[PDB]
Structure 1
Amino acid sequence: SKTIVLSVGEATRTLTEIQSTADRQIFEEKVGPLVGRLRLTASLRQNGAKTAYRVNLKLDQADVVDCSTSVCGELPKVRYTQVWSHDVTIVANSTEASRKSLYDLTKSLVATSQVEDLVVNLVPLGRAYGGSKTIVLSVGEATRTLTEIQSTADRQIFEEKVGPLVGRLRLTASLRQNGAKTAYRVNLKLDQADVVDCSTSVCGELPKVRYTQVWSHDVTIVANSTEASRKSLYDLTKSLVATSQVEDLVVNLVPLGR
């Protein structure tokens, strides 16, 4: 019926819709046993006085092993789950090119090879070639190069240096491990403030920000994983953001599934 396909190269893993509430919308892959499958929980709200929407994707991935042939008399069983949530904040009175460019940066943020090593191999962001540690975010041919301005114990704040100080691109990456060293937690956050200048119309007007639009990430990685399991979780989220269904979910708020 209603499907999203996720190409991981030449192999496509098509999800099917299994549940549809007013806002929540649960997808699932219908191949294999019933105990652990791919999951995709989209949502869409508007918080407060109808002024800001809130998209919330969440891609689960359970590692199912079936040891019925080796060990006699047991069933398939979920080892662990690794999620990759999203949290997009879109303001209602925005222009289209602000939230299109927010999608274009996050599509190119996931697709780079530095966030690949952050999820798969847990290496922090930023690589220094000729100066400080930078991430390049090509949105086509234009490359918006962020530079690292801070390195805390876990936090790592990036920023673009072109333009005024009031509104700039941001990246507050993080990396933790909760409890008894059993699961990591990566947390990216890309802020995009829309600054405007009225100098050609009004005398002496310094630039100011109108609104702000974020795209948070929340990756959960368990410690005893397989490296091929962290690679497939990154490859599905890289393929999920690159689809045209999530493009219309952020730019035009069209729900998923066709």
Structure 2
Amino acid sequence: SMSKTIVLSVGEATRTLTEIQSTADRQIFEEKVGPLVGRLRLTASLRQNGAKTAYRVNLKLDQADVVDSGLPKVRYTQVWSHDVTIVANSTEASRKSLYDLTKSLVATSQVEDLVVNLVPLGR
């Protein structure tokens, strides 16, 4: 209850990423299940540019593939990172619109097909 988390729902299941590191710049959430190697991990950071005219949100989801013939071992890692440029004097509506448009984009079957089957966008 008291560790901070982000909870991801995939259909009927939910997957809780527990915060394992927090610094002024950066945050790391990891899923507390399974082998200690290759746990699902979310790295997130917020940063201003030198001019203080824009922000950069970085989010990075690392999904490792662990095989366990004896003791566990990460075979490979697949990653989906995000890089969001927010302008400091932007209207809130402009940021909500970017968010709304991306939530829709990622939710499309076309983007599912691209990532899962390498099928080009456009129908």
Coarse TM-score class (shorter-chain normalised): over 0.9
The answer to whether the aligner puts 1:143 opposite 2:14 as a matched pair is: yes
Deviations 1:201-247 (A, max 9, x none): xxx71111111100010000000000000000000000000000000
The answer to whether the aligner puts 1:163 opposite 2:34 as a matched pair is: yes
Mapped to 2, the partners of 1:131 and 1:167 lie a distance apart of 24
SS at match of 2:76: strand
CA RMSD of aligned residues (A): 0.9
Shift of the alpha carbon at 1:180? Answer: 2.0
Mapped to 2, the partners of 1:149 and 1:186 lie a distance apart of 19
The answer to whether the aligner puts 1:250 opposite 2:115 as a matched pair is: yes
The answer to whether the aligner puts 1:231 opposite 2:96 as a matched pair is: yes
Shift of the alpha carbon at 1:157? Answer: 0.5
Mapped to 2, the partners of 1:181 and 1:168 lie a distance apart of 35
Q: Normalized against structure 2, the TM-score is what?
A: 0.97
Mapped to 1, the partners of 2:51 and 2:107 lie a distance apart of 36
Mapped to 2, the partners of 1:230 and 1:162 lie a distance apart of 35
Shift of the alpha carbon at 1:141? Answer: 1.0
Q: Which residues of structure 2 form unaligned runs of 5+?
A: none
2:25 to 149, 154, 174: 154
SS at match of 1:181: coil
Mapped to 2, the partners of 1:135 and 1:153 lie a distance apart of 18
Larger radius of gyration: 1
Q: Which residues of structure 1 form unaligned runs of 5+?
A: 1-129, 198-203
SS at match of 1:206: coil
Q: Which has the higher strand share?
A: 2
SS at match of 1:215: strand
Shift of the alpha carbon at 1:152? Answer: 1.2
Mapped to 2, the partners of 1:165 and 1:184 lie a distance apart of 33
Mapped to 2, the partners of 1:178 and 1:256 lie a distance apart of 32
Shift of the alpha carbon at 1:190? Answer: 0.2
SS at match of 2:22: coil
The answer to whether the aligner puts 1:177 opposite 2:42 as a matched pair is: no
Deviations 1:96-124 (A, max 9, x none): xxxxxxxxxxxxxxxxxxxxxxxxxxxxx
Deviations 1:131-155 (A, max 9, x none): 1111100111110100000001211
Shift of the alpha carbon at 1:179? Answer: 1.5
Give the number of aligned pairs. 123
